[PDB]
Design a protein around this nucleic acid. Structure first.
Ligand code: PAR
Ligand code: K
Ligand code: K
Ligand code: K
Ligand code: K
Ligand code: K
Ligand code: K
Ligand code: K
Ligand code: K
Ligand code: K
Ligand code: K
Ligand code: K
Ligand code: K
Ligand code: K
Ligand code: K
Ligand code: K
Ligand code: K
Ligand code: K
Ligand code: K
Ligand code: K
Ligand code: K
Ligand code: K
Ligand code: K
Ligand code: K
Ligand code: K
Ligand code: K
Ligand code: K
Ligand code: K
Ligand code: K
Ligand code: K
Ligand code: K
Ligand code: K
Ligand code: K
Ligand code: K
Ligand code: K
Ligand code: K
Ligand code: K
Ligand code: K
Ligand code: K
Ligand code: MG
Ligand code: MG
Ligand code: MG
Ligand code: MG
Ligand code: MG
Ligand code: MG
Ligand code: MG
Ligand code: MG
Ligand code: MG
Ligand code: MG
Ligand code: MG
Ligand code: MG
Ligand code: MG
Ligand code: MG
Ligand code: MG
Ligand code: MG
Ligand code: MG
Ligand code: MG
Ligand code: MG
Ligand code: MG
Ligand code: MG
Ligand code: MG
Ligand code: MG
Ligand code: MG
Ligand code: MG
Ligand code: MG
Ligand code: MG
Ligand code: MG
Ligand code: MG
Ligand code: MG
Ligand code: MG
Ligand code: MG
Ligand code: MG
Ligand code: MG
Ligand code: MG
Ligand code: MG
Ligand code: MG
Ligand code: MG
Ligand code: MG
Ligand code: MG
Ligand code: MG
Ligand code: MG
Ligand code: MG
Ligand code: MG
Ligand code: MG
Ligand code: MG
Ligand code: MG
Ligand code: MG
Ligand code: MG
Ligand code: MG
Ligand code: MG
Ligand code: MG
Ligand code: MG
Ligand code: MG
Ligand code: MG
Ligand code: MG
Ligand code: MG
Ligand code: MG
Ligand code: MG
Ligand code: MG
Ligand code: MG
Ligand code: MG
Ligand code: MG
Ligand code: MG
Ligand code: MG
Ligand code: MG
Ligand code: MG
Ligand code: MG
Ligand code: MG
Ligand code: MG
Ligand code: MG
Ligand code: MG
Ligand code: MG
Ligand code: MG
Ligand code: MG
Ligand code: MG
Ligand code: MG
Ligand code: MG
Ligand code: MG
Ligand code: MG
Ligand code: MG
Ligand code: MG
Ligand code: MG
Ligand code: MG
Ligand code: MG
Ligand code: MG
Ligand code: MG
Ligand code: MG
Ligand code: MG
Ligand code: MG
Ligand code: MG
Ligand code: MG
Ligand code: MG
Ligand code: MG
Ligand code: MG
Ligand code: MG
Ligand code: MG
Ligand code: MG
Ligand code: MG
Ligand code: MG
Ligand code: MG
Ligand code: MG
Ligand code: MG
Ligand code: MG
Ligand code: MG
Ligand code: MG
Ligand code: MG
Ligand code: MG
Ligand code: MG
Ligand code: MG
Ligand code: MG
Ligand code: MG
Ligand code: MG
Ligand code: MG
Ligand code: MG
Ligand code: MG
Ligand code: MG
Ligand code: MG
Ligand code: MG
Ligand code: MG
Lengths: 138, 124
RNA sequence: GGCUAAUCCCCCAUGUGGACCCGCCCCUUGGGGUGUGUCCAAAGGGCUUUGCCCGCUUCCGGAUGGGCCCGCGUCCCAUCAGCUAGUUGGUGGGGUAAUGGCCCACCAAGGCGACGACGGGUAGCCGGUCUGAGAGGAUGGCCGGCCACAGGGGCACUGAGACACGGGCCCCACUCCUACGGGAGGCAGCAGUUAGGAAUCUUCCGCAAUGGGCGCAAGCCUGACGGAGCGACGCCGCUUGGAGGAAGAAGCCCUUCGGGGUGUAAACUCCUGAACCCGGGACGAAACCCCCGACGAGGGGACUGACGGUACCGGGGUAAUAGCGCCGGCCAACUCCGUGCCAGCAGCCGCGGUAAUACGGAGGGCGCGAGCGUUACCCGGAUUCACUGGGCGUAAAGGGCGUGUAGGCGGCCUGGGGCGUCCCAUGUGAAAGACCACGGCUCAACCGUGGGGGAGCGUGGGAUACGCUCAGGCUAGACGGUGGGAGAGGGUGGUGGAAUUCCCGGAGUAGCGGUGAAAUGCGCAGAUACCGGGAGGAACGCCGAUGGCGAAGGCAGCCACCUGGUCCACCCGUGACGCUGAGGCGCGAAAGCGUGGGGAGCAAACCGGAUUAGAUACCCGGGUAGUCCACGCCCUAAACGAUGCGCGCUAGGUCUCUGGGUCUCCUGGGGGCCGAAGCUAACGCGUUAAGCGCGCCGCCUGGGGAGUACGGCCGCAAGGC
RNA sequence: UUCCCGGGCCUUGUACACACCGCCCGUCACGCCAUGGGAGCGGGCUCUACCCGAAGUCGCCGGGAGCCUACGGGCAGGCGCCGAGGGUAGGGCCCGUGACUGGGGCGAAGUCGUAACAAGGUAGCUGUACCGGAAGGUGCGGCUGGAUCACUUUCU
């Protein structure tokens, strides 16, 4: 089995985008889906949808990129330049609202998991709560 | 190492070892000169350097460089040593303070006088 | 021995009350109430003397101070791994203000430890302090808090309180007194002496102020303290002058010998005027007390200054200390002379052996300035122990491999709980310090007032995504079934042919052998070469590979038996049963060791022949251990892919081994090569990762000393870890 | 065109770079220094057993043996447990010194050969084992981190 399904996902995505895949499938879990929603809403992916690869539930994650480019190497810029796991089995990271980070002076996001559900570093700061710092994305 | 490992063994702090067992850390130590030889520098250099075996109050005996143009240290001179090796004479790690006790200051010195115990040239 | 007072001791009484035993009630560990029984009080003094003051007794409560207990936190060494008998607990006592093995009887046989017991080292802890962007590192001096000690060890007495620094008792070491029996003493109080040391002050003034003890008070005591003294030891403030002065004195230093520099710097001119001399001269000090009032509230008056004739104000008034380091790069500042691997410099790199910006001096210059340098030590830079924030193919670093304990980590869905996690409120977080603001000394240092923070912990309430836990469910992980497959995987027994050596027989004759060339050697007791027969040991040609099997080491004729791993198909069964794995256990090439056996060939040592300058080698002829088998040890290695195991993700092309399929091709497992993206110091790696990621283990931290020494463990030893 | 000398181009190995007349290894000699083992002789700690045991609290006695007494009891005194400390025997650890002894680091120009680096002139390295003035040689097995296609010959 996978030891960390969220990191598995964050990477399937990190990988897929580096070779400009169209979409990418990841085994499904409510928690994973919950993270995609933030991912979608903040405009990092085009969105996702439940599908059934073989006989088991996955989540096509439609990736998104910038426009073709000039000079050598026309490959487009990435929407997801950076996506990294923070809390991990073996080293869970929890923060208080006063301790929620600020990814790239705001140009990026942190996805916390609170008792008020999965939120971004703002949705969390707004609702005045903290929790498990899941990852940062920019 | 894994975090579990750092939790199990942790990092190990670096213990810095001295280059001046002038004991008590002390800035200086007093001693009496046993021998008052001369030594040959290593490879790149050549000359007759003035050293001095010293028996310290520290309860130690070590060679100490005698800086300056010319000295006056016999076999029973009361000397004060300080840290400071001499890169050329392996084994010499301290300097005698010219201007304290028996080791007279350097004469006709006019530049770096304080470093050689030579009082401000009289007259105007 | 004798006399004697009391707020000294005792007896009887009174009993608000309180203590004790027993019972009852509430309450809940010994808290509060109630009843009977018993037990327990006291001190007088002064008067402005018959009414106040000071004091006494018992009890309840407050306030302050403190004892004991508990959670969590608190350095180094595992080259310290087992520790423990009052030890762990129980019953009953003793003891105390009080719980408790605190102590004692008796009973039980427990308690502690890799989450580091026990042992060894080191050390008062904290608020804070220094450093750092922070995290962190280092640190605990002054000041404030707690602890401990008072020559060293032990002990109790008195008391609200001590096991008592200037109280007592004993032992010990020391100093002093001694009419030798025996006594006296303890500066880690202030000041001072001496010793040690690189180094740390006055045998000062005062009790005026704040604080303390006793007293009704007057007041006494206070080396606590308030001051002064010494030391640039630190911090802050200040002075050694200000303005004008030559297309620029002299001297000195360079020079292209024209001139350039020190430099408006100096002399001079004018101005101010630190020091010093006069005059004045303080805040800190208003209470205690006395008078009025009521000994209260309130009002009034008096005394009191160590610092000190100091601060400060006013008058007068001189132009009057500058040093230290550095100038090759890092690093700001350059020239002449001197010296010639010398004398010397040196933080690192290095500099000096005839024209040295690096040694020494001088001129000039940079830096800083009552200081400047040096040494020592702490943090920094050092993401160089990397939590923030590092690494291990070839740089130091993957454990020789497996099995597996603890531990760390854990797929999808639902539910309860709410330990972690998060939120709110609240308490706590002393003062000083730190931060901000305003303010007091002419400023500042310093100081006052005020404000703002703060992690952690306690309490109450709340949330439930993630982690945890419990309960239920699932099949995508893992395992199992059925049917197929490939293989030098392992163990035991048997067995085949080639060759070498030896022995026997035949036939045959002068050499064979060996090298660069030779010789030693073997051969007429007939060798070599050839044929036939026999014995024995060891190893398996071709197939054979660029191949296969195994966890590694490793595994190769053929046959049988016993036995391990593994791949594919079918989706059949279980239902997260998983990954990793400190220690443990097992395996582990060669050489080597022990016992016994074997011994053809080969061959350390060794014996000889050559070679060479020598030749304890290379070459040649011999040859013992060993190489082989059994059993038992050893436990190493370039034990290598120099690449730990597992899982998911990220172009392809090509060769190949083994399986399945609709069999040009597809699909699974393994072995190679070239390469996408990406990674890498580069080389290179690249679905067989050295890519992108998660989990767990092992390991690295400059080189030599050294895989050494010591210790421990293991081994018969060699020697291993 | 094999060989000797000089040279040109490509390639390969290299530990060389005032560049093979390069580099470099170990023994030994000389000097300075730190250090291991170590008979014995000193100093210290600690633990076990047995023995002696001050002060003091506590316990028992306190009697025709003492003092007080309102006869209840108190004090003196005595004995005992514990007890600082000391002694003896043994056990373990540390420390100073130490005859004798092992190797090590460092020090311009001493000695011996030539092991390594190029196929280093016998490829090297390696674990082990024996042997040798020294580097090292040889045996067995392993590795590639070995050059090309297939007499011997030191040094600077
Ligand atoms: N210090 C080197 C160590 O000892 C040995 O080396 C030592 C000796 O072999 C060596 O001696 C050399 C000699 O080899 C060479 N052929 C001649 C030279 N004169 C000697 O030199 C030695 O002695 C002289 C005085 O005579 C000193 O001035 C010099 O500094 C010193 N190294 O000097 C070393 C001592 O300094 C090891 N071989 C070496 O691997 C190890 O690292
Ligand atoms: K009397
Ligand atoms: K009563
Ligand atoms: K009270
Ligand atoms: K109280
Ligand atoms: K209390
Ligand atoms: K008890
Ligand atoms: K930080
Ligand atoms: K600290
Ligand atoms: K500390
Ligand atoms: K601290
Ligand atoms: K009073
Ligand atoms: K009054
Ligand atoms: K004045
Ligand atoms: K002047
Ligand atoms: K000259
Ligand atoms: K020169
Ligand atoms: K110069
Ligand atoms: K100079
Ligand atoms: K540092
Ligand atoms: K290794
Ligand atoms: K091992
Ligand atoms: K729940
Ligand atoms: K700070
Ligand atoms: K709280
Ligand atoms: K092969
Ligand atoms: K042997
Ligand atoms: K064998
Ligand atoms: K064995
Ligand atoms: K097929
Ligand atoms: K590259
Ligand atoms: K290559
Ligand atoms: K040992
Ligand atoms: K042994
Ligand atoms: K061994
Ligand atoms: K020829
Ligand atoms: K050696
Ligand atoms: K009696
Ligand atoms: K190399
Ligand atoms: Mg030189
Ligand atoms: Mg120094
Ligand atoms: Mg100088
Ligand atoms: Mg009397
Ligand atoms: Mg009563
Ligand atoms: Mg009651
Ligand atoms: Mg009652
Ligand atoms: Mg009665
Ligand atoms: Mg009474
Ligand atoms: Mg009266
Ligand atoms: Mg009790
Ligand atoms: Mg009690
Ligand atoms: Mg006890
Ligand atoms: Mg036991
Ligand atoms: Mg101490
Ligand atoms: Mg830092
Ligand atoms: Mg700071
Ligand atoms: Mg800090
Ligand atoms: Mg203090
Ligand atoms: Mg003393
Ligand atoms: Mg009292
Ligand atoms: Mg006292
Ligand atoms: Mg005390
Ligand atoms: Mg005293
Ligand atoms: Mg002295
Ligand atoms: Mg006073
Ligand atoms: Mg007073
Ligand atoms: Mg001039
Ligand atoms: Mg002027
Ligand atoms: Mg004037
Ligand atoms: Mg008074
Ligand atoms: Mg009156
Ligand atoms: Mg009155
Ligand atoms: Mg008044
Ligand atoms: Mg400069
Ligand atoms: Mg000259
Ligand atoms: Mg000279
Ligand atoms: Mg010169
Ligand atoms: Mg210059
Ligand atoms: Mg310089
Ligand atoms: Mg650091
Ligand atoms: Mg890290
Ligand atoms: Mg590194
Ligand atoms: Mg390496
Ligand atoms: Mg390995
Ligand atoms: Mg395993
Ligand atoms: Mg497990
Ligand atoms: Mg889970
Ligand atoms: Mg678990
Ligand atoms: Mg909770
Ligand atoms: Mg709080
Ligand atoms: Mg505070
Ligand atoms: Mg002000
Ligand atoms: Mg304040
Ligand atoms: Mg907070
Ligand atoms: Mg709470
Ligand atoms: Mg709930
Ligand atoms: Mg749950
Ligand atoms: Mg379940
Ligand atoms: Mg099968
Ligand atoms: Mg086989
Ligand atoms: Mg045969
Ligand atoms: Mg014959
Ligand atoms: Mg015949
Ligand atoms: Mg013959
Ligand atoms: Mg004949
Ligand atoms: Mg014969
Ligand atoms: Mg024959
Ligand atoms: Mg035959
Ligand atoms: Mg035979
Ligand atoms: Mg394999
Ligand atoms: Mg192999
Ligand atoms: Mg099988
Ligand atoms: Mg099924
Ligand atoms: Mg089922
Ligand atoms: Mg073996
Ligand atoms: Mg063997
Ligand atoms: Mg044998
Ligand atoms: Mg044998
Ligand atoms: Mg035999
Ligand atoms: Mg032979
Ligand atoms: Mg010969
Ligand atoms: Mg031979
Ligand atoms: Mg290999
Ligand atoms: Mg792909
Ligand atoms: Mg392929
Ligand atoms: Mg493949
Ligand atoms: Mg294939
Ligand atoms: Mg293969
Ligand atoms: Mg590329
Ligand atoms: Mg390149
Ligand atoms: Mg490749
Ligand atoms: Mg992978
Ligand atoms: Mg290691
Ligand atoms: Mg080292
Ligand atoms: Mg070192
Ligand atoms: Mg080392
Ligand atoms: Mg070894
Ligand atoms: Mg053994
Ligand atoms: Mg030629
Ligand atoms: Mg040519
Ligand atoms: Mg040409
Ligand atoms: Mg080339
Ligand atoms: Mg060439
Ligand atoms: Mg010794
Ligand atoms: Mg006794
Ligand atoms: Mg007694
Ligand atoms: Mg008695
Ligand atoms: Mg005793
Ligand atoms: Mg060789
Ligand atoms: Mg050679
Ligand atoms: Mg060679
Ligand atoms: Mg040669
Ligand atoms: Mg050879
Ligand atoms: Mg060779
Ligand atoms: Mg080689
Ligand atoms: Mg060998
Ligand atoms: Mg030999
Ligand atoms: Mg070999
Ligand atoms: Mg040569």
């Amino acid at each position: 089995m996978l030891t960390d399904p969220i990191a598995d996902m964050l990477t399937r995505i990190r990988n897929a985008t580096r070779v400009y895949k169209e979409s990418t499938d990841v085994p499904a879990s409510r928690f994973k889906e919950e993270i995609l929603r933030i991912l979608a809403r903040e405009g990092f992916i085009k969105g996702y949808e439940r599908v059934d690869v073989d006989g088991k539930p996955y989540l096509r994650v439609y990736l998104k990129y910038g426009p073709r480019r000039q000079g050598p190497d026309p490959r487009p810029e990435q929407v997801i330049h950076h996506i990294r796991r923070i809390s991990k089995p073996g080293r869970r990271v929890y923060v208080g609202v006063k301790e929620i980070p600020r990814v790239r002076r705001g140009l990026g996001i942190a996805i916390l998991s609170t008792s008020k559900g999965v939120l971004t570093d703002r949705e969390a700061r707004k609702l005045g709560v903290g929790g498990e710092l899941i990852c940062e994305v920019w | 190492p894994t975090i579990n490992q750092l939790v199990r063994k942790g990092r190990e702090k670096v213990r810095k070892k001295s280059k001046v067992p002038a004991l008590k850390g002390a800035p200086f130590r007093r001693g009496v000169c046993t021998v008052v030889r001369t030594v040959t520098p290593k490879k790149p250099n050549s000359a007759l350097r003035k050293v001095a075996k010293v028996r310290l109050t520290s309860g130690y005996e070590v060679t100490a460089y005698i800086p300056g143009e010319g000295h006056n240290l016999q076999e029973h001179s009361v000397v004060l040593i300080r840290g400071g090796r001499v890169k050329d004479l392996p084994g010499v790690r301290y300097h005698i303070v010219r201007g304290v006790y028996d080791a007279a200051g350097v004469k006709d010195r006019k530049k770096s006088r304080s470093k050689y115990g030579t009082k401000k040239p009289k007259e105007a």
